[PDB]
Amino acid sequence: EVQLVESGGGLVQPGGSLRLSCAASGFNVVDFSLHWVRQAPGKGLEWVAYISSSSGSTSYADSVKGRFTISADTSKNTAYLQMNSLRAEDTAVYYCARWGYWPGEPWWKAFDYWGQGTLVTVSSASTKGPSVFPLAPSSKSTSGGTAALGCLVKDYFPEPVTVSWNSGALTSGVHTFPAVLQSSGLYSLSSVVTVPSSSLGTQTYICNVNHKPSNTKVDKKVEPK
Amino acid sequence: MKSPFYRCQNTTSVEKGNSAVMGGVLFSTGLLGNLLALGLLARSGLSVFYMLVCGLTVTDLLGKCLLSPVVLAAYAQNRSLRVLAPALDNSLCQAFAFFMSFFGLSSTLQLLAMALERWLSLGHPFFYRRHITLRLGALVAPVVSAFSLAFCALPFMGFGKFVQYCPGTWCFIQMVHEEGSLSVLGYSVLYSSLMALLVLATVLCNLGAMRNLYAMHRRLQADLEDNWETLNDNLKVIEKADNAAQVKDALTKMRAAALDAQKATPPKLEDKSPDSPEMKDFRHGFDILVGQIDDALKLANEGKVKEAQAAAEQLKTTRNAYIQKYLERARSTLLEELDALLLLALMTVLFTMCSLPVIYRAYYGAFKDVKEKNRTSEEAEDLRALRFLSVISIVNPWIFIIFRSPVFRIFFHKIFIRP
Amino acid sequence: DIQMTQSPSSLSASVGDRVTITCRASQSVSSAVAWYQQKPGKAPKLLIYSASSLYSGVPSRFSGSRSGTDFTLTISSLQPEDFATYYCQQYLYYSLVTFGQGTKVEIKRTVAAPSVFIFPPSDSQLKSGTASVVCLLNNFYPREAKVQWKVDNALQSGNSQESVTEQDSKDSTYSLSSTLTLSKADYEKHKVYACEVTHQGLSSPVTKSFNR
Amino acid sequence: QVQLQESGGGLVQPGGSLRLSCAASGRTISRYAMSWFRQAPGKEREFVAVARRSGDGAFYADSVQGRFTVSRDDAKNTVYLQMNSLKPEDTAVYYCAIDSDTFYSGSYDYWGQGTQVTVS
């Protein structure tokens, strides 16, 4: 079996430092080279750095060189990446991969084994609580048709947040939108649902929101005006 | 023995023209050429292509030596070929015509087999080494001679007949026969049709061989010479270079070139498996060169330049020590292939352009009634057709003697070098 | 650097089609080109490793081809577990490695037009001290749509943010929300607010409005 | 100005077939997309089909799909609509329109003049 495992990711302040550890299992690091790659939220792949254990050879990318340091040790069979002066453009998911040696078949198969990923978040913010606001539908219009209604889960930190409807009773027609980063560093989210326009369904609607980092559970009841 | 169109049939009185002088000088030239060519060809042999050429030349020399003294003796008594001995009446004509047609057909068939073998060897290497052997290829000339004997013995069966052409010497196939029976016309049309088919097949094989050789030339050049030249140019660039970024750029270009070149294939042993030892030696040389590229790249990534240039010099040494042999063998093989194809083509054009007029004469004079005077229109044209048929055996070895002669071989080598 | 450009960007296809993606290099990298597949919230996987060679395990319906500096990935027949993002890479040496942009492949369906809804700010937010109006587009195909927010015959280009869900599991459509936020200085100084929606499957723009 | 010419249509037997074309007068199609629309006698315009750029696909409404087909020729700069298995509900005045953008945000502002198609 061959296996690569990463560790060491988490929330750090701007200007802070972190240390990622890629541990290999089922093969010897001494016979392969190791590489670090990253992916930003909503974007594509990007190579970061390179270590060769036997030769001692080391190389870094232009967005990275001078600020990261890759290292290894074969006694404990591990490679390390040290991140020093972090900015908000460095928040991403980081992966570790191997590459074989010339000559032969091992060089012509580039990145046959990849790690698992670790998420690094760079933000200067403190944990807050979500405020819930109704989205009251308009007056009785399109009575034959349908109507829409939702609740805003606004100004929380950090990810993630779970929103449910009528304590999980309603599941069809509900569209929860992905969170959006505001200019203030907090987040926002909307949950909506569509209802047959007969006294708004002759029922009141209850939307529930959870937040484990702050341990809050606030409720909202939405009523047409 | 009374005909208006060929009135020389029964004429035993020859005309005292210059036919004997031209016949003697042309026979002397042909015999001199045959002897000189066989002498120049004996010591090289002591390729299936060149043994086929030698067999062709031997057959031509034997035919010329057999037919010349008969005409010499017929002219010696200053009479016609109709009768020379009382007991051998009208047999000299038959023997002359039979042998002449026999040698013509044998020569054409051997040229066709030569061209077919050349195209096949350049085109189907698997079938080239799979089936034919030199011992099996040595017996084609008896086979061709036997088939020519079988085909030219048909007039003795009765389907065709020979007639004497004036003055007193020529004997050849009857052509028009007063627009009469379907036998003689059938024989003439069959003969000229067979010659036309052979000429067309020879030209087709020549064109196919030329296209395959052009394909091999293009493949070889693209696969090896461009990659070799970009290697050498980037070596020069590094030797001139001064900054590490330029060195890294040049070495990336060399790495691409060497990887592509290791994918290539030499023109010989294209039938051979990739596990043949010569292929493994090719690959091993390129592996060592790639490793030294990696060493110079590693050492130049750290800002040090002189050691990168030293590893470049080591690249030059191993490049000369491991790689040049296959490139040289490739180009030498290409030049030999061009040489053999040029010889085949220069014989093919001569055979066709000297064999066309008899084909035209038998075609036009078959489906046509009596027309025009039968004194100078028919006779001069037929003498011209016979002369153009007879030229083949006289100039055949001479052009080869010109081409293979070492002084003109070097002269043509310089001529080919010039463009 | 060795730039390498990928095309198309958002291919739309159905089960059984034959799909072709093109990648283009700026130099000669020989045949040292690879193709990868990635699903949302997972790691990339290798499919083709030498511009034509199949890695051990991936199915045989993937093929790769080289012709000069132009490279082609082909999927001859398609199955539901092939809708992903696909990536291109060159690898000529250890220290020089470059990826493409990716080509997401979606599902094909019939045209529907967006349904529009509007909501006014609620009084719980009104006492807090901010204002936020929203507009919802429901169940539309294709992906492209345009939303305009206007106030009292004046286009607004201030605070406007927008979000899109992913393709539904059932009807393979999109939903879209546009939220516009302003302070009470500007919210109470204007009277009417309008949402304008345009789409390919819509002969004339659909508008909705509220008067304060 | 920009002009669009629609040429075709007429009284055609039920169950029949037709073909229509749009002519790119003026500034030509360029790298645009072409939209084909209905107009029923007693209703409002409805979407029929659309053809996008050359590498991209062609899109249909729910009812029309399975019978029509939209194609183009950039050489002549025209677009063609093909029908099949016509029905009594297909009769309407047919329109051709352009959207004045390149990012596929439909701003249909260059209507042609229409074309009357009668069945039964």
Side-chain angles (χ1 to χ4, degrees), chain A, chain B residues 3-135 137-413 415-419, chain C, chain D:
Chain A
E1 73 279 16
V2 187
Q3 188 172 0
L4 286 91
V5 165
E6 289 104 319
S7 294
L11 171 77
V12 295
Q13 293 268 330
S17 303
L18 209 59
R19 198 164 144 112
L20 296 203
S21 161
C22 186
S25 173
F27 83 102
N28 272 120
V29 161
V30 71
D31 292 332
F32 289 91
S33 48
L34 291 153
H35 304 254
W36 284 93
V37 184
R38 89 186 160 181
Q39 166 160 64
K43 309 282 194 180
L45 310 170
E46 182 181 359
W47 180 87
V48 161
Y50 155 68
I51 189 79
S52 191
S53 181
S54 316
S55 311
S57 310
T58 292
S59 87
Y60 302 109
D62 287 331
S63 50
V64 166
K65 179 184 181 66
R67 286 194 308 117
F68 285 34
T69 288
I70 190 170
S71 155
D73 46 359
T74 318
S75 51
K76 41 177 63 71
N77 215 15
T78 308
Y80 306 79
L81 184 72
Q82 160 87 37
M83 303 178 186
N84 260 349
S85 316
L86 287 167
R87 291 189 294 273
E89 291 85 3
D90 291 332
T91 168
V93 164
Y94 290 76
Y95 311 90
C96 179
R98 64 198 271 274
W99 191 351
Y101 271 117
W102 188 256
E105 270 284 289
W107 191 86
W108 282 106
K109 320 206 272 280
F111 279 152
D112 51 346
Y113 282 92
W114 289 69
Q116 67 171 25
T118 319
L119 167 78
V120 168
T121 319
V122 188
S123 67
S124 70
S126 295
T127 73
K128 278 194 57 156
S131 50
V132 188
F133 294 141
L135 292 173
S138 293
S139 282
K140 299 303 289 197
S141 314
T142 75
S143 189
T146 197
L149 70 161
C151 56
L152 260 172
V153 181
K154 188 171 167 63
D155 282 347
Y156 65 88
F157 189 84
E159 306 269 329
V161 170
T162 299
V163 175
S164 283
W165 274 99
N166 269 3
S167 311
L170 260 178
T171 179
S172 80
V174 49
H175 288 187
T176 311
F177 287 87
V180 160
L181 177 61
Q182 307 180 178
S183 88
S184 89
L186 280 300
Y187 289 131
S188 291
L189 184 144
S190 309
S191 199
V192 308
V193 69
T194 52
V195 59
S197 187
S198 49
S199 172
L200 267 294
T202 75
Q203 278 150 59
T204 175
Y205 289 85
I206 299 294
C207 82
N208 302 116
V209 53
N210 281 18
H211 201 206
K212 276 71 65 180
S214 277
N215 281 122
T216 185
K217 288 98 193 170
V218 62
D219 201 323
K220 190 53 72 189
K221 182 187 186 300
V222 291
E223 199 261 326
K225 61 98 176 179
Chain B
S3 179
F5 55 89
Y6 290 145
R7 293 183 184 272
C8 315
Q9 184 157 359
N10 216 10
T11 60
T12 62
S13 87
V14 307
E15 280 74 50
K16 214 66 191 61
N18 47 357
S19 309
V21 173
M22 58 81 72
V25 66
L26 290 177
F27 157 66
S28 85
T29 318
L31 185 62
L32 194 149
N34 271 308
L35 290 190
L36 185 63
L38 191 147
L40 195 143
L41 272 170
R43 89 288 195 280
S44 288
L46 186 61
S47 289
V48 193
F49 178 82
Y50 276 87
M51 71 98 62
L52 275 163
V53 170
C54 281
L56 181 74
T57 305
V58 172
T59 309
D60 182 78
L61 162 69
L62 192 145
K64 194 169 310 183
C65 187
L66 190 149
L67 274 73
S68 187
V70 158
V71 164
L72 175 69
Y75 185 77
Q77 306 313 302
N78 278 321
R79 59 182 149 188
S80 167
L81 206 48
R82 156 69 41 83
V83 53
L84 290 180
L88 319 173
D89 55 355
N90 291 69
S91 306
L92 268 299
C93 209
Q94 302 162 356
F96 184 84
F98 171 72
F99 285 151
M100 189 174 178
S101 311
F102 168 85
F103 287 127
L105 204 64
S106 182
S107 180
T108 312
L109 290 175
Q110 282 179 6
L111 188 87
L112 173 67
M114 185 188 293
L116 186 149
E117 188 271 334
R118 200 57 195 155
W119 165 80
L120 187 143
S121 71
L122 199 45
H124 295 87
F126 299 145
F127 193 79
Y128 189 33
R129 88 286 183 272
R130 192 183 177 185
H131 184 275
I132 61 171
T133 66
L134 197 141
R135 266 165 175 172
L139 56 94
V140 294
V143 166
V144 161
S145 312
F147 187 57
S148 179
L149 186 76
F151 190 84
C152 290
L154 187 144
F156 287 163
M157 201 50 69
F159 187 80
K161 63 100 172 179
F162 300 127
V163 70
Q164 194 276 332
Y165 282 67
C166 45
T169 45
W170 297 78
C171 203
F172 192 72
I173 297 93
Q174 180 84 96
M175 302 288 283
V176 55
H177 194 271
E178 58 94 24
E179 310 100 13
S181 175
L182 275 83
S183 176
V184 179
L185 276 302
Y187 176 79
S188 169
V189 168
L190 179 63
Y191 188 87
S192 283
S193 170
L194 180 58
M195 313 272 306
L197 302 168
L198 295 186
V199 162
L200 191 76
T202 311
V203 174
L204 283 180
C205 286
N206 278 51
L207 289 166
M210 292 181 183
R211 283 304 102 176
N212 279 14
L213 192 63
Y214 182 78
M216 161 180 319
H217 160 91
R218 286 287 106 174
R219 176 189 298 111
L220 194 155
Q221 171 166 349
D223 283 353
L224 260 171
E225 271 79 1
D226 302 321
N227 298 328
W228 187 257
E229 185 64 30
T230 179
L231 284 165
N232 277 300
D233 176 42
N234 282 305
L235 273 162
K236 186 192 182 313
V237 167
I238 283 184
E239 188 66 27
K240 181 63 173 63
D242 68 300
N243 207 353
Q246 293 192 51
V247 175
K248 201 199 175 175
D249 186 22
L251 285 159
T252 51
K253 282 175 183 173
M254 285 182 223
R255 197 176 167 85
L259 268 35
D260 267 332
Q262 193 185 7
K263 271 159 200 159
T265 312
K268 205 181 180 293
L269 53 82
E270 282 167 314
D271 55 339
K272 278 292 182 35
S273 58
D275 272 307
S276 79
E278 189 275 330
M279 288 294 254
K280 273 189 159 281
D281 297 0
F282 202 60
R283 293 196 174 85
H284 184 88
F286 271 110
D287 286 14
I288 289 172
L289 200 83
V290 164
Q292 296 193 6
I293 293 163
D294 284 353
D295 275 331
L297 267 173
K298 300 285 178 68
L299 272 300
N301 264 330
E302 302 153 17
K304 311 178 293 175
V305 190
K306 273 75 174 176
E307 308 183 0
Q309 301 186 359
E313 305 322 294
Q314 279 276 317
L315 277 151
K316 253 178 177 174
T317 284
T318 177
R319 190 214 60 187
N320 286 2
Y322 269 151
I323 302 315
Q324 287 263 3
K325 317 159 69 70
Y326 321 97
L327 200 64
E328 301 290 84
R329 286 174 197 173
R331 295 183 275 236
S332 76
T333 306
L334 268 195
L335 272 196
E336 292 181 8
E337 296 292 327
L338 183 138
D339 190 359
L341 271 192
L342 260 177
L343 186 59
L344 177 72
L346 62 87
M347 285 184 182
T348 282
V349 172
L350 187 149
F351 263 63
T352 297
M353 292 297 105
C354 281
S355 196
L356 199 83
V358 175
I359 302 167
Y360 181 79
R361 281 294 272 164
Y363 186 85
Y364 194 69
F367 315 135
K368 183 61 70 71
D369 210 348
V370 61
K371 189 256 290 181
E372 207 175 0
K373 53 176 77 74
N374 311 329
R375 183 65 183 88
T376 182
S377 178
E378 208 87 26
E379 295 298 273
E381 206 173 2
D382 289 332
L383 274 172
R384 154 159 299 111
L386 266 296
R387 208 168 304 116
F388 275 165
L389 190 75
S390 61
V391 161
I392 280 173
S393 292
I394 302 301
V395 72
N396 198 11
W398 272 100
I399 193 67
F400 158 71
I401 279 172
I402 292 305
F403 211 88
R404 205 193 181 274
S405 66
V407 293
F408 197 78
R409 194 52 92 85
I410 300 300
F411 180 75
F412 162 70
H413 182 216
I415 286 303
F416 168 75
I417 279 172
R418 184 87 262 172
Chain C
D1 293 331
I2 303 188
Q3 285 71 236
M4 202 172 186
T5 72
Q6 198 165 348
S7 62
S9 301
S10 198
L11 189 136
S12 313
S14 42
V15 173
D17 281 329
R18 156 197 203 93
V19 183
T20 285
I21 314 174
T22 306
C23 195
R24 168 65 180 270
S26 76
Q27 283 197 19
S28 172
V29 303
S30 189
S31 63
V33 164
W35 293 93
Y36 299 92
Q37 184 201 75
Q38 195 190 11
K39 310 274 192 80
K42 292 290 181 224
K45 292 190 193 111
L46 172 84
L47 314 158
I48 304 297
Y49 68 78
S50 198
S52 302
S53 295
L54 204 76
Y55 181 51
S56 315
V58 307
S60 43
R61 75 186 175 258
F62 297 89
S63 73
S65 173
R66 184 209 177 183
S67 300
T69 53
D70 291 296
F71 304 86
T72 287
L73 171 79
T74 312
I75 318 171
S76 78
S77 173
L78 201 143
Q79 278 73 246
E81 48 92 25
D82 292 333
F83 292 120
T85 315
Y86 296 86
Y87 289 98
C88 195
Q89 181 214 4
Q90 65 94 6
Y91 58 101
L92 199 61
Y93 185 49
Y94 282 152
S95 86
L96 48 97
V97 163
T98 310
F99 289 96
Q101 293 76 60
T103 300
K104 160 69 184 166
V105 297
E106 68 172 0
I107 316 171
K108 189 83 162 295
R109 57 155 279 127
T110 75
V111 166
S115 93
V116 193
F117 299 88
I118 203 171
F119 299 88
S122 176
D123 49 353
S124 291
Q125 198 214 48
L126 260 288
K127 52 167 62 62
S128 287
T130 55
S132 63
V133 297
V134 306
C135 205
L136 163 72
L137 269 51
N138 203 349
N139 290 127
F140 65 100
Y141 191 92
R143 186 176 188 270
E144 281 85 343
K146 185 249 286 183
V147 187
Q148 294 291 145
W149 273 101
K150 58 186 168 286
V151 179
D152 57 33
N153 203 350
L155 266 299
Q156 315 291 86
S157 183
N159 271 315
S160 314
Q161 271 178 343
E162 184 261 335
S163 163
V164 183
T165 77
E166 300 269 25
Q167 269 202 33
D168 263 349
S169 55
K170 302 298 290 294
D171 64 318
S172 311
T173 48
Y174 295 93
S175 285
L176 198 144
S177 287
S178 80
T179 309
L180 178 134
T181 60
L182 289 175
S183 80
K184 306 307 187 63
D186 295 326
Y187 179 59
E188 302 290 331
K189 79 184 297 181
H190 293 310
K191 188 61 70 177
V192 295
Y193 288 71
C195 198
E196 194 90 23
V197 177
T198 79
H199 192 48
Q200 284 274 281
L202 214 66
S203 79
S204 190
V206 164
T207 188
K208 294 196 76 164
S209 64
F210 75 93
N211 190 359
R212 170 193 162 277
Chain D
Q1 59 95 34
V2 178
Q3 193 39 255
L4 278 299
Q5 207 46 61
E6 306 96 10
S7 46
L11 197 142
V12 177
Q13 44 202 356
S17 309
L18 265 162
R19 284 185 65 249
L20 282 83
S21 313
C22 199
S25 302
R27 64 180 286 165
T28 322
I29 49 173
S30 180
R31 71 281 188 195
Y32 293 173
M34 295 296 107
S35 74
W36 279 108
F37 271 110
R38 263 178 198 174
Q39 161 61 91
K43 273 78 70 178
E44 182 63 26
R45 276 82 172 171
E46 290 302 314
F47 183 74
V48 180
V50 61
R52 275 166 158 183
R53 217 172 284 103
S54 312
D56 304 329
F59 299 89
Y60 303 126
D62 203 353
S63 50
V64 167
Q65 187 178 3
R67 310 186 294 101
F68 283 43
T69 291
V70 189
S71 44
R72 72 195 305 161
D73 53 354
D74 292 310
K76 212 185 299 181
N77 298 113
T78 60
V79 292
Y80 310 142
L81 184 66
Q82 288 79 238
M83 299 180 186
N84 174 23
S85 314
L86 276 299
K87 292 305 281 292
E89 292 92 4
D90 293 331
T91 181
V93 184
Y94 284 54
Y95 289 85
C96 174
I98 328 297
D99 42 355
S100 310
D101 78 315
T102 183
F103 274 81
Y104 292 163
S105 302
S107 47
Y108 299 136
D109 294 330
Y110 292 148
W111 301 104
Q113 304 306 128
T115 285
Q116 164 63 241
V117 171
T118 312
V119 297
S120 274

PDB file of all heavy atoms in Angstrom, chain C residues 140-152:
ATOM      1  N   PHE C 140     -33.873  28.329 -13.903  1.00  0.00           N
ATOM      2  CA  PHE C 140     -33.609  28.787 -15.253  1.00  0.00           C
ATOM      3  C   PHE C 140     -32.448  28.043 -15.892  1.00  0.00           C
ATOM      4  O   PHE C 140     -31.502  27.633 -15.226  1.00  0.00           O
ATOM      5  CB  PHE C 140     -33.324  30.277 -15.276  1.00  0.00           C
ATOM      6  CG  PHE C 140     -32.071  30.689 -14.548  1.00  0.00           C
ATOM      7  CD1 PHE C 140     -30.903  30.936 -15.243  1.00  0.00           C
ATOM      8  CD2 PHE C 140     -32.081  30.888 -13.183  1.00  0.00           C
ATOM      9  CE1 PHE C 140     -29.779  31.338 -14.599  1.00  0.00           C
ATOM     10  CE2 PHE C 140     -30.954  31.296 -12.543  1.00  0.00           C
ATOM     11  CZ  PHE C 140     -29.799  31.521 -13.254  1.00  0.00           C
ATOM     12  N   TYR C 141     -32.520  27.911 -17.220  1.00  0.00           N
ATOM     13  CA  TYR C 141     -31.507  27.316 -18.078  1.00  0.00           C
ATOM     14  C   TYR C 141     -31.553  28.071 -19.400  1.00  0.00           C
ATOM     15  O   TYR C 141     -32.653  28.385 -19.868  1.00  0.00           O
ATOM     16  CB  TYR C 141     -31.743  25.824 -18.318  1.00  0.00           C
ATOM     17  CG  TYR C 141     -30.567  25.155 -18.978  1.00  0.00           C
ATOM     18  CD1 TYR C 141     -29.570  24.561 -18.222  1.00  0.00           C
ATOM     19  CD2 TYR C 141     -30.441  25.134 -20.360  1.00  0.00           C
ATOM     20  CE1 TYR C 141     -28.492  23.966 -18.820  1.00  0.00           C
ATOM     21  CE2 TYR C 141     -29.362  24.550 -20.960  1.00  0.00           C
ATOM     22  CZ  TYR C 141     -28.397  23.962 -20.185  1.00  0.00           C
ATOM     23  OH  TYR C 141     -27.326  23.368 -20.788  1.00  0.00           O
ATOM     24  N   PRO C 142     -30.401  28.407 -20.027  1.00  0.00           N
ATOM     25  CA  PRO C 142     -28.982  28.180 -19.666  1.00  0.00           C
ATOM     26  C   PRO C 142     -28.471  28.895 -18.426  1.00  0.00           C
ATOM     27  O   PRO C 142     -29.221  29.471 -17.662  1.00  0.00           O
ATOM     28  CB  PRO C 142     -28.222  28.695 -20.901  1.00  0.00           C
ATOM     29  CG  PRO C 142     -29.200  28.684 -22.003  1.00  0.00           C
ATOM     30  CD  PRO C 142     -30.506  29.012 -21.364  1.00  0.00           C
ATOM     31  N   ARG C 143     -27.162  28.848 -18.203  1.00  0.00           N
ATOM     32  CA  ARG C 143     -26.603  29.451 -17.005  1.00  0.00           C
ATOM     33  C   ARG C 143     -26.672  30.962 -17.058  1.00  0.00           C
ATOM     34  O   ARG C 143     -26.889  31.604 -16.030  1.00  0.00           O
ATOM     35  CB  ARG C 143     -25.159  29.006 -16.818  1.00  0.00           C
ATOM     36  CG  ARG C 143     -24.542  29.458 -15.521  1.00  0.00           C
ATOM     37  CD  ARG C 143     -23.148  28.910 -15.357  1.00  0.00           C
ATOM     38  NE  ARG C 143     -22.630  29.202 -14.028  1.00  0.00           N
ATOM     39  CZ  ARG C 143     -21.958  30.297 -13.714  1.00  0.00           C
ATOM     40  NH1 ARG C 143     -21.684  31.220 -14.618  1.00  0.00           N
ATOM     41  NH2 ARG C 143     -21.551  30.471 -12.461  1.00  0.00           N
ATOM     42  N   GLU C 144     -26.502  31.540 -18.238  1.00  0.00           N
ATOM     43  CA  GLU C 144     -26.339  32.980 -18.368  1.00  0.00           C
ATOM     44  C   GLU C 144     -27.648  33.709 -18.108  1.00  0.00           C
ATOM     45  O   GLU C 144     -28.705  33.311 -18.595  1.00  0.00           O
ATOM     46  CB  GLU C 144     -25.806  33.312 -19.756  1.00  0.00           C
ATOM     47  CG  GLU C 144     -24.311  33.076 -19.911  1.00  0.00           C
ATOM     48  CD  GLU C 144     -23.968  31.643 -20.272  1.00  0.00           C
ATOM     49  OE1 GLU C 144     -24.818  30.750 -20.092  1.00  0.00           O
ATOM     50  OE2 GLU C 144     -22.837  31.405 -20.739  1.00  0.00           O
ATOM     51  N   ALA C 145     -27.566  34.771 -17.318  1.00  0.00           N
ATOM     52  CA  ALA C 145     -28.701  35.630 -17.037  1.00  0.00           C
ATOM     53  C   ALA C 145     -28.154  37.000 -16.691  1.00  0.00           C
ATOM     54  O   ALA C 145     -26.975  37.145 -16.368  1.00  0.00           O
ATOM     55  CB  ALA C 145     -29.564  35.083 -15.903  1.00  0.00           C
ATOM     56  N   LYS C 146     -29.010  38.010 -16.785  1.00  0.00           N
ATOM     57  CA  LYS C 146     -28.622  39.361 -16.402  1.00  0.00           C
ATOM     58  C   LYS C 146     -29.674  39.975 -15.493  1.00  0.00           C
ATOM     59  O   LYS C 146     -30.869  39.925 -15.800  1.00  0.00           O
ATOM     60  CB  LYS C 146     -28.414  40.243 -17.626  1.00  0.00           C
ATOM     61  CG  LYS C 146     -27.895  41.615 -17.295  1.00  0.00           C
ATOM     62  CD  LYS C 146     -28.952  42.658 -17.568  1.00  0.00           C
ATOM     63  CE  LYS C 146     -29.122  42.875 -19.055  1.00  0.00           C
ATOM     64  NZ  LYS C 146     -30.111  43.948 -19.349  1.00  0.00           N
ATOM     65  N   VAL C 147     -29.222  40.575 -14.394  1.00  0.00           N
ATOM     66  CA  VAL C 147     -30.082  41.255 -13.433  1.00  0.00           C
ATOM     67  C   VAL C 147     -29.642  42.707 -13.340  1.00  0.00           C
ATOM     68  O   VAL C 147     -28.444  42.993 -13.257  1.00  0.00           O
ATOM     69  CB  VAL C 147     -30.028  40.590 -12.049  1.00  0.00           C
ATOM     70  CG1 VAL C 147     -31.058  41.200 -11.131  1.00  0.00           C
ATOM     71  CG2 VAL C 147     -30.220  39.096 -12.164  1.00  0.00           C
ATOM     72  N   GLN C 148     -30.607  43.616 -13.370  1.00  0.00           N
ATOM     73  CA  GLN C 148     -30.382  45.034 -13.145  1.00  0.00           C
ATOM     74  C   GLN C 148     -31.205  45.481 -11.949  1.00  0.00           C
ATOM     75  O   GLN C 148     -32.361  45.079 -11.797  1.00  0.00           O
ATOM     76  CB  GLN C 148     -30.775  45.872 -14.359  1.00  0.00           C
ATOM     77  CG  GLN C 148     -29.947  45.664 -15.607  1.00  0.00           C
ATOM     78  CD  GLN C 148     -28.538  46.173 -15.461  1.00  0.00           C
ATOM     79  OE1 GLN C 148     -27.602  45.590 -15.998  1.00  0.00           O
ATOM     80  NE2 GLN C 148     -28.371  47.245 -14.701  1.00  0.00           N
ATOM     81  N   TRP C 149     -30.602  46.299 -11.097  1.00  0.00           N
ATOM     82  CA  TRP C 149     -31.290  46.950  -9.992  1.00  0.00           C
ATOM     83  C   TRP C 149     -31.373  48.430 -10.323  1.00  0.00           C
ATOM     84  O   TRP C 149     -30.354  49.045 -10.648  1.00  0.00           O
ATOM     85  CB  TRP C 149     -30.536  46.755  -8.673  1.00  0.00           C
ATOM     86  CG  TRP C 149     -30.870  45.512  -7.917  1.00  0.00           C
ATOM     87  CD1 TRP C 149     -30.143  44.361  -7.872  1.00  0.00           C
ATOM     88  CD2 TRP C 149     -32.000  45.305  -7.070  1.00  0.00           C
ATOM     89  NE1 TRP C 149     -30.757  43.443  -7.061  1.00  0.00           N
ATOM     90  CE2 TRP C 149     -31.901  44.000  -6.556  1.00  0.00           C
ATOM     91  CE3 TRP C 149     -33.090  46.093  -6.700  1.00  0.00           C
ATOM     92  CZ2 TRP C 149     -32.852  43.467  -5.696  1.00  0.00           C
ATOM     93  CZ3 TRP C 149     -34.032  45.563  -5.845  1.00  0.00           C
ATOM     94  CH2 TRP C 149     -33.909  44.263  -5.355  1.00  0.00           C
ATOM     95  N   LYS C 150     -32.568  49.006 -10.265  1.00  0.00           N
ATOM     96  CA  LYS C 150     -32.684  50.427 -10.553  1.00  0.00           C
ATOM     97  C   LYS C 150     -33.553  51.125  -9.522  1.00  0.00           C
ATOM     98  O   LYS C 150     -34.454  50.531  -8.915  1.00  0.00           O
ATOM     99  CB  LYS C 150     -33.221  50.697 -11.963  1.00  0.00           C
ATOM    100  CG  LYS C 150     -34.573  50.104 -12.257  1.00  0.00           C
ATOM    101  CD  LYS C 150     -34.926  50.300 -13.719  1.00  0.00           C
ATOM    102  CE  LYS C 150     -36.122  49.455 -14.097  1.00  0.00           C
ATOM    103  NZ  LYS C 150     -35.748  48.021 -14.191  1.00  0.00           N
ATOM    104  N   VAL C 151     -33.229  52.400  -9.310  1.00  0.00           N
ATOM    105  CA  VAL C 151     -33.915  53.279  -8.375  1.00  0.00           C
ATOM    106  C   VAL C 151     -34.236  54.575  -9.104  1.00  0.00           C
ATOM    107  O   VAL C 151     -33.349  55.155  -9.743  1.00  0.00           O
ATOM    108  CB  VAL C 151     -33.047  53.570  -7.136  1.00  0.00           C
ATOM    109  CG1 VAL C 151     -33.769  54.503  -6.192  1.00  0.00           C
ATOM    110  CG2 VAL C 151     -32.630  52.282  -6.449  1.00  0.00           C
ATOM    111  N   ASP C 152     -35.506  54.994  -9.038  1.00  0.00           N
ATOM    112  CA  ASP C 152     -36.032  56.291  -9.512  1.00  0.00           C
ATOM    113  C   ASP C 152     -35.348  56.794 -10.785  1.00  0.00           C
ATOM    114  O   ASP C 152     -34.878  57.933 -10.864  1.00  0.00           O
ATOM    115  CB  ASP C 152     -36.014  57.353  -8.396  1.00  0.00           C
ATOM    116  CG  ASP C 152     -34.635  57.592  -7.777  1.00  0.00           C
ATOM    117  OD1 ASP C 152     -33.598  57.497  -8.461  1.00  0.00           O
ATOM    118  OD2 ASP C 152     -34.593  57.911  -6.570  1.00  0.00           O
TER     119      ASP C 152
END
